[PDB]
């Protein structure tokens, strides 16, 4: 089972699923082998009913699509649609939060409110919305209106791009026509230009993809901004991760998906139904996180993380998961059939994300508390149905220190330099105690033994004094293997990084270091890493493509992860991807994405499936940036 | 060659391409055989990097996608994305025209203007925009603003849906949540909900697809409305079609694509450069149409149609096509390589639709006349380069009567009843002289011998007294085979239909009938057929799903054609498709789309590849509707 997952709790549940005959994502993967090589290389097109068209990577015909589309065009069009789909998910999430904020301050949903006034006012200021002499509810109404306005064309470009990057970067992007005009506008223009008989030039297509990836960035940053207003900006928190955070004698409720508009309420309501849970025989209601929605409530409330991404079914296999409360994105639809076997109540809540066989509860912000109670009462009923049934919760968990929003990181650094908080970080980059920064992002992928790339790469970088930050299921992988536990700094970190983590920790009252890896939150919270890197750029007076900062989507899966990787390139970062995107069937497209895009944005993809080799390539990229700054390396 | 195309001019050019070694769309099709059956049946998914996933239609594993996605989900998600892509093309076209209109009346593009004031005021009235006491430029600015507003959420739904269908139909659709909130909003929500780990219920997914198809309808109707304001509403016109409209001694310039914002200007400018063309040795500039842009200028100006859709390369093979001026959509990218062999100058004009190897001219409304002159001067230079070269223009053309906008049809009928113009049509439906109405729409498809389904089905319906209207490359197929020539009424039409065509024609001064088939314009001008059918419904006080009206996308290809077929179903029509959409791998999805959707919208798909059988099925659907109205059949 260690070929399937490096997580020992997952291995234990894989054994249980095997002897119980429950098919898993790994079993469905094995049944899919050998996979189609045309699709794997990108040399397949179904964009019209003359298809499917495929192209042999090598050999004889077919060499060209039926309409004349070359390999270059087919690969670029498929890639562009994946970016647009990712942008559609992150920005649909943000759009939902924008409507929630508007409702809240219009008096239409009293379960929601402005919790972070400071964040609200700074966002308003960033956008040029006046605050002086204004009601908070009116400032927020203006912010929500501005958020919704960025989805369409207007007299300004997308402000959640142009106001969040340095002016020099906006200038570079504008010169190449890469600033989005509107988030949904760009998504639609991608779908148009990639449809049959439209755009048929690889460079033109890919420039469109870069622009659409910035629409994805805008959606991420908008989602983080709005969630922080509504639910609070994260600060350091201590909790735990992995299946051992389940409790046989509690009602175990997983929140799973992405948008916490529901699950932040589930958290608060669950606390108030403790006595109702005790009346039914439980100790209380044990809310645990899966995937991004779990990251959101981990960051804000210290809710323990149960599992992530590829191993999500395994939480159900314990037999102790009484309910799984779903919104959207990254939910394996198998959970609805597995629930028949495990007893778990799977509940969908969003109109546009239903799963056949799951119970649907039509969540409305107007009714959030009542919806939560309905849902948790199904969870309580399910807990009662498993009175006397044995469960198998692996007794495996790690300690997790998390909550490192960019505001929190700045505050932590400010204890070393109150009026120039980024300077202590830059000082230690300059003197080599910090070699660079690496952001781990994205999913697990059934093709890669779960977590193996994240942990292999992170271990090598940490020993080379790289400051590692993480989001999404990259953070999930790292937390479940101990990388967010400060007790592991001695083992994992080079001496210079240890010195810095310790200096910052001891200045924040901890008597111990910061953890080896800084958890910056959910996938939309990749925007937080952008805020940090942009602030560093501004403090240094350089653009992001001169900073020793890289990104790694080491086990990427979702179209959202392709979008994030693409905007990391577009904003200037060397960006590793540890799974093959469907591009190897076109050398010209591969060359654009890994090489000549450097001349456009200064970033570039590093495609590398071997994680030891990927780490060396990422270190080389960091060190090239150090050399460009005149720094030792 | 008659297995490839039923058009004799196309057959002749296929022989020429064969002996010259020029590969065609039919050759690239042959090289693609056998095509992938997983894609053909819809049982393939590449929506994440764990894929590709396929499902065997029958037999053993793989039976399910790696994430758990069933055949039903995979097929519905692929279909939904095709609808969104079609919606993105028709509404990108409309959006462009909306910006052009705004520019025109803001004084920013004097080559454009309000040409149809009557149309402008009636659209304003339909939308609830005040006209009394307003400048035309201000009415138009408001109409353009309303058009752009329908692309995003706002306090009203999409007005180019809710103001163009009968209130009873809007009520049925609203009750099922099918009215779009915004055109690009729905496109993005499709891409979101079909991404990995989101919507996974076939019925829910397909309801989303129906709503997105109405976003496509809105884009079509907006495009027709705005083009009529800017360029004039079509009225009856006489011209010709097929390759014989090329002239060896003229500069032959094809306008090809969809959006006529450029090609309407090309037409007017070409007339003024006649003397410059004569100075270079030509008789003049001969502008001819390909695909929809050609339909647009055929309808408004009587520009002859050269060819359509699958046979577009054949215009170049004559050797006489001096330039091909492209905007976007349905342009085989092969034309850019074929041009090397044929001498043709292929010119792209739109930023988001480029073709490697073609010359690009960056058209701007602000500069339309100057751009046109630059483009036509390249065409003149190319004409000069072929001094003394033999050309092979097949001497094959048909006479075409076209221009039957809905306003024109109403005006024609009004000569039989001035104050109740629809009543003569309804009278003849009631007494059986008109059995029903059939709209032929959509593309040619290399899988079907070109035009064979359109002409086979049309011949059977016309003999059964069906009033046949046509758009797009369906109109192209019918015009090239003589179905728009009134001289063929005796041969083609049943006696009752002949009587009606003759009565209307003789009342309009013609001394002859209307043509056998009424050309209602381009693909967005399928919206004109909706206006006609909606007006009939309103006059009868019934919904569209009680009218004896059907649609046939008899040789469909483009994602746009899937979108149109889907909104024809959604607004209440029995809708034939003569090529397999990728749905046969899921019987549940097939059953929804061909049967249980009747219970939602009253329309339904008729999937039938045999055209004689399709005609019988369409007649049965028409006759069932007649029976529901209590009419003989
Ligand atoms: S768009 Fe071109 S390459 Fe794609 S399926 Fe259609 S014919 Fe084939
Ligand atoms: S979304 Fe599911 S079915 Fe599609 S490729 Fe990914 S794992 Fe396979
Ligand atoms: S041929 Fe397998 S992905 Fe299309
Ligand atoms: S397996 Fe051929 S279309 Fe994917």
From Swiss-Prot, chains A, B:
Q: Which cofactor does it need?
A: [4Fe-4S] cluster; [Ni-4Fe-5S] cluster
Which GO MF term does the entry hold, naming one? anaerobic carbon-monoxide dehydrogenase activity
Give EC number(s), comma-separated.
1.2.7.4
Primary enzyme class:
oxidoreductase
Identify one Gene Ontology CC term for this UniProt entry.
cytoplasm
Which InterPro entries does this chain map to? Answer: CO_DH_a-bundle, CODH, HCP/CODH, Prismane-like_a/b-sand, Prismane-like_sf
Q: How is its activity regulated?
A: Inactivated by O(2).
Coiled-coil regions listed in the entry: none
| Compartments reported by the entry | Cytoplasm; Cell membrane
List the keywords (alphabetical): 4Fe-4S, Cell membrane, Cytoplasm, Iron, Iron-sulfur, Membrane, Metal-binding, Nickel, Oxidoreductase
Catalyses which reaction(s): CO + 2 oxidized [2Fe-2S]-[ferredoxin] + H2O = 2 reduced [2Fe-2S]-[ferredoxin] + CO2 + 2 H(+)
Residue spans crossing the bilayer: none
Q: How is the cofactor bound?
A: Binds 3 [4Fe-4S] clusters per homodimer. Binds 2 [Ni-4Fe-5S] clusters per homodimer.
Domain of life assignment:
Bacteria
Q: For this entry, list what GO says about its biological process.
A: generation of precursor metabolites and energy; response to hydrogen peroxide
The residues the record assigns to binding [4Fe-4S] cluster 1 are 36, 44
Positions contributing to [Ni-4Fe-5S] cluster binding: 258, 292, 330, 443, 473, 523
Annotated residues for binding of [4Fe-4S] cluster 2: 45, 48, 53, 67
Record text about domains: Cluster B is an all-cysteinyl-liganded 4Fe-4S cluster; cluster C is a mixed Ni-Fe-S cluster which is the active site of CO oxidation. Cluster D is also an all-cysteinyl-liganded 4Fe-4S cluster that bridges the two subunits of the CODH dimer.
Family that this chain belongs to? Belongs to the Ni-containing carbon monoxide dehydrogenase family.
NCBIfam families (UniProt xref): CO_DH_cata
Q: How does it assemble?
A: Homodimer.
Job of this protein: CODH oxidizes carbon monoxide coupled, via CooF, to the reduction of a hydrogen cation by a hydrogenase (possibly CooH).
* Protein name, per record: Carbon monoxide dehydrogenase 2
Report the source organism: Carboxydothermus hydrogenoformans (strain ATCC BAA-161 / DSM 6008 / Z-2901)
What gene is this protein translated from? cooS2
